[PDB]
Design a binder for this molecule. Structure first.
Ligand code: 4YV
Length: 300
């Protein structure tokens, strides 16, 4: 097929500074940082993900990098570059408000229907792009959707892109089959996560039981804020026949239609009176903010 002409950027350790830690785990550790390229006279807010040095773990992060450098869409997290140190580190865009899952939990009181439906449109768009780029995500969830601004979210975590049981289609659990329509199932679950303001799908139920539960016809419940219209979409994403499930281009259309009249499709008490930070807020954006540009505007 088509040759992947993507440019992998190698960045000097000296070109950027680690400010603080955003999160630590098995993988290694993610840092908040700043990147000052050559003599460009720009500071770019970044997220630096670094890995003990074991040759197998380096192969895995270099696979994640391959995919992350291969994307270019406004609702997908691109790889800005890699830095070849003793450890090896991925340089990514800083998503100041972190993951969407924590965002919905921490801000339910100010999250209205417009935001929820717009997020749904945005994820369906990012996913539809991955489909265009013949890419299967294999790990879609509200944890792998990051918040740039409350009005702008992006799909990330290409560690699996070519197990998270409670997000997986039936075929994926029983036959290890992953299609674009299997991503649609995880899209349905992500939407559920948002509509419930961050609830754990199948709370209490052990991963082993899930397979049988789904086989019986059981599915995640209707969130209180959901109209039949919205839940009916979520349910279509969880059909046994993957070809029956909606396509991402349809999901874009469906949520977009609904985002034009959010109150008709999501019933939230206090809606419209609620407000989240915007680039039109006082002090929305620590050192020298003098020449800071966002990565989405920095293009060599
Ligand atoms: C499991 O390892 C990685 C996989 C990639 N993923 C990512 N992709 C693009 C940009 C970005 N930037 C980002 C991430 C942030 C953040 C600000 N920007 N604040 C919190 N996080 C994540 C990583 C630490 C815990 C949650 N992160 C973060 C976690």
């Amino acid at each position: 097929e088509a040759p992947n002409q993507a440019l992998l950027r190698i960045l000097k350790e000296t070109e950027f500074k680690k400010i603080k830690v955003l999160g630590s785990g098995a993988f290694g550790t993610v840092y908040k940082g700043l990147w000052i390229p050559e003599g460009e006279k720009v500071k770019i807010p970044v997220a630096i993900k670094e890995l003990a040095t074991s040759p197998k773990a380096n192969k895995e992060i270099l696979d994640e990098a391959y995919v992350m450098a291969s994307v270019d869409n406004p609702h997908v997290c691109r790889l800005l570059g890699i830095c070849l140190t003793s450890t090896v580190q991925l340089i990514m865009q800083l998503m100041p408000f972190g993951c969407l899952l924590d965002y919905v939990r921490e801000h339910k009181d100010n999250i209205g229907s417009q935001y929820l439906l717009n997020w749904c449109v945005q994820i369906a768009k990012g996913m539809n792009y991955l489909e265009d780029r013949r890419l299967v995500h294999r790990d879609l969830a509200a944890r792998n959707v990051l918040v740039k601004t409350p009005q702008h979210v992006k799909i990330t975590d290409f560690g699996r892109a070519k197990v998270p049981i409670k997000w997986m289609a039936l075929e994926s659990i029983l036959h290890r089959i992953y299609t674009h329509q299997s991503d649609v199932w995880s899209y349905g679950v992500t939407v559920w996560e948002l509509m419930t303001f961050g609830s754990k799908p199948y709370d209490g139920i052990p991963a082993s039981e899930i397979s049988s539960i789904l086989e019986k016809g059981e599915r995640l419940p209707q969130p209180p804020i959901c109209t039949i219209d919205v839940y009916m979409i979520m349910v279509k994403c969880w059909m046994i026949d993957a070809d029956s499930r909606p396509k991402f281009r349809e999901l874009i259309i469906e949520f977009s239609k609904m985002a034009r009249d959010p109150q008709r499709y999501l019933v939230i008490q206090g809606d419209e009176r609620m407000h989240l930070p915007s680039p039109t807020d006082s002090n929305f954006y620590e050192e020298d903010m003098d020449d800071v540009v966002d990565a989405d505007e920095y293009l060599i």
